[PDB]
Design a protein around this ligand. Sequence first.
Ligand code: 2R9
Ligand code: ZN
Length: 200
Amino acid sequence: SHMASMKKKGSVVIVGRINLSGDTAYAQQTRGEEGCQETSQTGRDKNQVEGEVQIVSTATQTFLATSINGVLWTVYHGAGTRTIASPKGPVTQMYTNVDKDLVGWQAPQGSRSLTPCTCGSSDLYLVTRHADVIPVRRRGDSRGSLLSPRPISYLKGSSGGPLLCPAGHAVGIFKAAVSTRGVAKAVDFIPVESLETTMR
Ligand SMILES: C=C[C@@H]1C[C@]1(NC(=O)[C@@H]1C[C@@H](Oc2ncc(OC)c3ccc(Cl)cc23)CN1C(=O)[C@@H](NC(=O)OC(C)(C)C)C(C)(C)C)C(=O)NS(=O)(=O)C1CC1
Ligand SMILES: [Zn+2]
């Protein structure tokens, strides 16, 4: 083929956040589609970053990313091997594991990090891209049941979002829905211990 006209994939772009700083959880958009597209190609993102849970986008997908221990984590099936846009240009992943469906970049300046859970608690809460907080009972190392099942439509675009313990520690990163006839009864996640193993 003709290398001179081979395209490059864009960067992952932060387009908003799930605000969890107050009494009420709600989604905020910080960048529109025109801006997202331009920032994805340049990889230069001068927007102020805040909070632990970012809403991110490529040209073709939108999902979430969560800061834990100074690393912005998300799913490989969303991000691939892409760089993330940042103030001084594209930033290369510092973690990539296709087997775990996991990628990570250094956490953006301005972001806040969740602390990894050491509670050993099995009463969890999944935070969606729509800022719904979904009670989840932990059922194994990497699976939890929804207390109230939801159609998979409800969860689509929330991979890379956090499962939190009652104290607000990060317990895992949302990976896949366990679905029966389109209804999500459970969720698979990357447990925080796996992140911490990946970090070492
Ligand atoms: C509905 C919301 C769920 C959380 C969600 N994730 C998904 O859709 C994922 C992607 C795909 O699975 C996997 N791909 C690649 C992997 O590695 C590279 C995986 C390594 C390990 C495992 Cl576990 C799965 C992997 C299929 N899938 C399912 O969840 C599927 N379920 C699934 O596969 O369930 C079982 C695993 C139990 C079979 C299905 C779509 C059918 C519900 C999402 O929101 N995505 S997204 O929209 O944001 C998209 C990033 C833009
Ligand atoms: Zn905890």
